[PDB]
Design a protein around this ligand. Structure first.
Ligand SMILES: CSC[C@H]1O[C@@H](n2cnc3c(N)ncnc32)[C@H](O)[C@@H]1O
Lengths: 625, 310
């Protein structure tokens, strides 16, 4: 199903008009709150004293209908940024008036136009309306993909259309929006209703709108081609956009007179629902992360915190991860136990942070798979989970498994270990402090001992999403730094966003760590070639680990382990968004810092411009030891 | 109430046109209240306007009427909010008005209409930013033009050439058109860019001169040849909505503005007459064919005012 609406600048009888669009199958109506041609005077007599009513009564519809079925429209005559004083003054009062009426009616959204570069006074007037009471009603800015001046036919002799190359010029429509939105201090209520024309721009220009808050897409009747059978259809490339737009889950709005007069306006809408259902279906991942898109969560800390039962439940809900683990251990055993030594030699396998023992069962299956003999210690500091292990051990595992209720850093092991197995990784790999935990337990691994996982590596990529930037901004909480939100990472299924460059590795860690002096503190400098004009809003985090040899796990999209939903990506926000221009390199600096007590990340952008160093001294965010 | 004739007239009188014979054609819309629509009315007695009862003929239109024009003596061409251009043909007894055709070609409100010299062709201007040329005979659009980058305010046909007309838009562009040329439009204007073009009026006799009004109440007299603005006076305290030349040998210019005021001016654009009669927006002005000293105005005050001009 597609949420779809009808835009009209002509409504004679609101009752009949709304009826029609319902029968035609439209979920909502975009229509004028005052007659589009009904200009109003506020300052100069006598026309200021024009007898009312000034527009049609709220009584003509149910409040419910006003709240759900109607999207308001600013009158086209209202031009707040006019060079003529008297027009700006009347346009100011008219905009307020019309905007206040939408509020009075409880309209769910109100359409405003960005058809020129200077909508400064328009931004200023709306801003006031927004700061006049606190309401949720959305404002859709009608901004065309392609400016109307760059769409005009080359039919003026003396004023010919410029066909010269215009990279930045062909993106002038986004800067219109960017500036308006910026003046209005990135208010959650101001979103984009993107208008599409017959001539699409370059993927380039379409690429500008990736992270932008697009609540609606407006499709004129004009852009629709005619199928053999006279049916409204669309270009393949027009269609690529619609599929793109469907992933962003925008509402669709049909504007203009029905040029396919044979068939009803359900003809146009039929096409969209046709394309909607004809989209390729959602993979497990797409299905798994169905509610979680651009939904910010704090990263888990299973060291300083004791995880809840249902937390482990969803850890365990990913079979691919444990199949990978079984395989790594399967392979490792065969590499350490020759078939001559199978029955004479039994390996000492220690699961460190066993939770409810999914890695214990994997270790067991791996041994029955490798027909080799294994001894198991399940070491777990969470005593709530230690309960689950002991019930498993008693009822099932038997004396083959020795449950150890201890921190791996403290535990004095009876005997040293052939292999150590661990799940101590987060969306940025080292963020749960696997390095420190495994470094502490390292001493009770044999000199020839193996660590599964052997190695892990964080990756970072710059991103643009004004959506998520504002989500972080809104995470401000009383009785803390007002900007603490910006100085902390968030695990999130990034969705409405743009990767500005290729992921590069950040921090790498190897277990065991042979270094004479072991330091898990890291300073990394990274340089991101950017080939588009954009605005940096933060850095997306991913990781890869090597369980054993070729067996690996990745949330890095390029190498992403397929069907594995065990980790969403991490996000490092920045306080102030940074404009980046095509060709420019983004230089970021990441530090992993440590106490006796705590570990944290500090980050800075040095190019194209310097940022503040974020999370200095872990003031805003730290990870417990 | 003639047969089909509505009982009451919409308050907002947008168009006032005098036939050759001296009849009065009125177009009115409903810009407020439950019903947003428009009607067409004929007053064979001009002085009985706007009384719906004492009207020759009357009809109701699906939607509002943004602009209107006479076609010969029996046809009315209608610019609708529907984005449709409609032709309404008069009764033989001229007692009723019937829709010859209603075509939804414009994607937004149809803001302006003019009739070409032939009367077999017409030009439409819309907030869709498009200008279309029509065959009134074939009831189809010959050519559609997307010259402008803003909604088209006014379109006005050359008096004596079927291929030439003016167009003005909020893109600060006045376009001279010749369908004959492969690039039919030519951007024409005063020395410096200025306030948006609002109103266009060709000279009766001097086919190479016209006047445009701006949203700053300044009327400017333009000669195509010289491509430079000959004369400009600030007639109105508001936007200049309409400009209408007298039937006189040396014509007079009627100036209507949102200042709710009318001015009448000589050749040199100097101001002979001014009328504060209207208490709302002055929408149209027609000179009586019968008495050339009589000029009739309509307002959104539903006032039909007959002026005697010195
Ligand atoms: C299964 S997710 C990781 C598991 O490791 C456990 N864990 C984390 N750090 C340590 C540690 N230092 N010693 C023992 N168990 C740990 C956590 O309680 C969690 O159940």
């Amino acid at each position: 199903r597609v949420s779809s609406g009808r835009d009209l600048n002509c409504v004679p009888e609101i009752a009949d008009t709304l009826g029609a669009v319902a029968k035609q199958g439209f979920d909502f109506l975009c229509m004028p709150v005052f007659h589009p041609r009904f200009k109003r005077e506020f300052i100069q007599e006598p026309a200021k004293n024009r007898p009312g009513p000034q527009t049609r009564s709220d009584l003509l519809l149910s409040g419910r209908d006003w709240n759900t079925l109607i999207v308001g429209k600013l009158s086209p005559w209202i031009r707040p940024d006019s060079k003529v004083e008297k027009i700006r003054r009347n346009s100011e009062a008219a905009m307020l008036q019309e905007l206040n009426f939408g509020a009075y009616l409880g309209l769910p959204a109100f359409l405003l136009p960005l058809n020129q570069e200077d909508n400064t006074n328009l931004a200023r007037v709306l801003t006031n309306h927004i700061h006049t009471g606190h309401h949720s009603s959305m404002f859709w800015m009608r901004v065309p993909l392609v400016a109307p001046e760059d769409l005009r036919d080359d039919i003026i002799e003396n004023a010919p259309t410029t066909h010269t190359e215009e990279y930045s010029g062909e993106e002038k429509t986004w800067m219109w929006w960017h500036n308006f939105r910026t003046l209005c201090d990135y208010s959650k209520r101001i979103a984009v209703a993107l208008e599409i024309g017959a001539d699409l721009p370059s993927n380039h220009v379409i690429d500008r709108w990736l992270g932008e808050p697009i609540k609606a897409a407006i499709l004129p009747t004009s852009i629709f081609l005619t199928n053999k059978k006279g049916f409204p259809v669309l270009s393949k490339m027009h269609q690529r956009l619609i599929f793109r737009l469907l992933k962003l889950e925008v509402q669709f709005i049909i504007t203009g007179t029905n040029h396919h007069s044979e068939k009803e306006f359900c003809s146009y809408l039929q096409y969209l629902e046709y394309l909607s259902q004809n989209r390729p279906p959602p993979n497990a991942y797409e299905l798994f992360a169905k509610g979680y898109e651009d939904y910010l969560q704090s990263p888990l800390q299973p060291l300083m915190d004791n995880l809840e039962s249902q937390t482990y439940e969803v850890f365990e809900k990913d079979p691919i991860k444990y199949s990978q683990y079984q395989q790594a251990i399967y392979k490792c055993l065969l590499d350490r136990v020759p078939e001559e030594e199978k029955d004479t030699n039994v390996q000492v396998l220690m699961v460190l942070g066993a939770g409810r023992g999914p890695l214990v069962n994997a270790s067991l299956r791996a041994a029955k798979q490798a027909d080799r003999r294994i001894k198991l210690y399940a070491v777990e500091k969470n005593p709530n989970a230690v309960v689950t292990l002991e019930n498993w051990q008693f009822e099932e595992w038997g004396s083959q498994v020795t449950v150890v209720s201890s921190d791996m850093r403290e535990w004095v092991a009876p005997e040293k270990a052939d292999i150590i197995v661990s799940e101590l990784l987060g969306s940025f790999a080292d963020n749960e402090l696997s390095p420190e935990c495994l470094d502490g337990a390292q001493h009770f691994l044999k000199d020839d001992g193996v660590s599964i996982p052997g190695e892990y590596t964080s990756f970072l990529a710059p991103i643009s999403s004004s959506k998520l930037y504002n989500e972080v901004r809104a995470c401000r909480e009383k009785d803390r730094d007002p900007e603490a939100q910006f100085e902390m990472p968030y695990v999130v299924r990034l969705h409405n966003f743009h990767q500005l460059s290729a992921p590069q590795p950040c921090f790498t860690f190897s277990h065991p760590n042979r270094d004479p002096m072991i330091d898990n503190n890291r300073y990394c400098t990274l340089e991101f070639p950017v080939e588009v004009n954009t605005v940096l809003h933060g850095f997306a985090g991913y990781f890869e680990t090597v369980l054993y040899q070729d067996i690996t796990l990745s949330i890095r999209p390029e190498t992403h382990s397929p069907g594995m939903f065990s980790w969403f990506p991490i996000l490092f926000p920045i306080k102030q968004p940074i404009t980046v221009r095509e060709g420019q390199t983004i230089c970021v600096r990441f530090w992993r810092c440590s106490n006796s007590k705590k570990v944290w990340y500090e980050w800075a952008v040095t190019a194209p411009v310097c940022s503040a160093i974020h999370n200095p001294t872990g003031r805003s965010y730290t990870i417990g030891l | 109430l003639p047969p089909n004739a509505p009982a009451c007239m919409e308050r907002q009188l947008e168009a006032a046109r005098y036939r050759s014979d001296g009849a009065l054609l009125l177009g009115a819309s409903s810009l407020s209240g439950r019903c947003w629509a428009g009607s067409l009315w004929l007053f064979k007695d001009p002085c009985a306007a706007p009384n719906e009862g004492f009207c020759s003929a009357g009809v109701q239109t699906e939607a509002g009427v943004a602009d209107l024009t006479w076609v010969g003596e029996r046809g009315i061409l209608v610019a609708s909010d529907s984005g449709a251009v409609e032709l309404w043909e008069l009764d033989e007894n001229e007692t009723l008005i019937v829709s010859k055709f209603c075509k939804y070609e414009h994607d937004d409100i149809v803001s302006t209409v003019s009739v070409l010299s032939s009367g077999t062709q017409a030009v439409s201007g819309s907030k869709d930013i498009c200008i279309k040329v029509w065959d009134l005979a074939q009831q189809v659009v010959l050519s559609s033009y997307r010259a402008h980058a803003a909604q088209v305010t006014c379109v006005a046909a050359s008096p004596h050439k079927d291929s030439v007309f003016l167009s003005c838009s909020e893109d600060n562009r006045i376009l001279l058109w010749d369908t004959r040329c492969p690039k039919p439009a030519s951007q024409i204007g005063c020395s410096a860019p200025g306030y948006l073009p609002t109103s266009l009026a060709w000279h009766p006799q001097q086919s190479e001169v016209f006047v445009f009004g701006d949203e700053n109440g300044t009327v400017s007299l333009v000669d195509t040849k010289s491509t430079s603005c000959v004369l400009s006076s600030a007639v109105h305290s508001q936007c200049v909505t309409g400009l209408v030349f007298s039937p006189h040998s040396v014509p007079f210019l009627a100036s209507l503005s949102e200042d709710c005021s009318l001015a009448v001016l000589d050749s040199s654009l100097s101001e002979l007459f001014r009328s504060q009669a209207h208490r709302d927006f002055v929408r149209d002005a027609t000179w009586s064919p019968l008495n050339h000293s009589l000029l009739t105005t309509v307002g959104w005050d539903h006032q039909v005012v007959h002026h005697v001009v010195p």
